[PDB]
Ligand binder design. Sequence first.
Ligand code: CO
Length: 163
Amino acid sequence: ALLEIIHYPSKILRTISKEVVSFDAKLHQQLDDMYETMIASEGIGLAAIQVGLPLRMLIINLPQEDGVQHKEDCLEIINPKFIETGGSMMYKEGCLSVPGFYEEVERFEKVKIEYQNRFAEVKVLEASELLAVAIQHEIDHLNGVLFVDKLSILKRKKFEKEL
Ligand SMILES: [Co+2]
C-alpha cells in the first residue's frame, strides 16, 4: 500500500528513530510499503521516519546502466552503523521530504557500514560515490537530520529564498 510521505518543516522529521528488534512479517510489510511508496514518488532512497515510522531502517535502490531501477538491487538497511569513514566531497542532493530543492552537501567520499537485512542477517557494506552519499543521507534521517541542515551559510540562504 502507498504511505504518505512527510515533508519539511514537519517536526516528525526531527525524531530520533529506534533500533529494530522484531524482524517479522509486520516489519516486512512496512519495508514493502516503503518501497512501493518510494517508487511511486520516484525516489532512490527513503528512511522510515519519512513515512512516520520512527524505526532505524531505510531503503536504497539506485538505477543502473539502463537507467532503470530493479527491485533486486534494492538495499534494506536496518540498525545501520558506520565502521569506517573517509575522504570528503561535495554532492548535490535532493530529498522526497524536501521536494523541489537541490543543493550541494559535503559528504564522506567513502564509507563502510554494518547492518542487518530484513531477516536479521548481519551485513557489511563498503560504498563510494552515489551509494555512499545515499547511505549517509538516509542514515542522517534516522537521527533527525535533513540535508538542508548541512548547508553552508550561503546555500542556506538560497534555500530560504526558494521557500
Ligand atoms: Co531524504
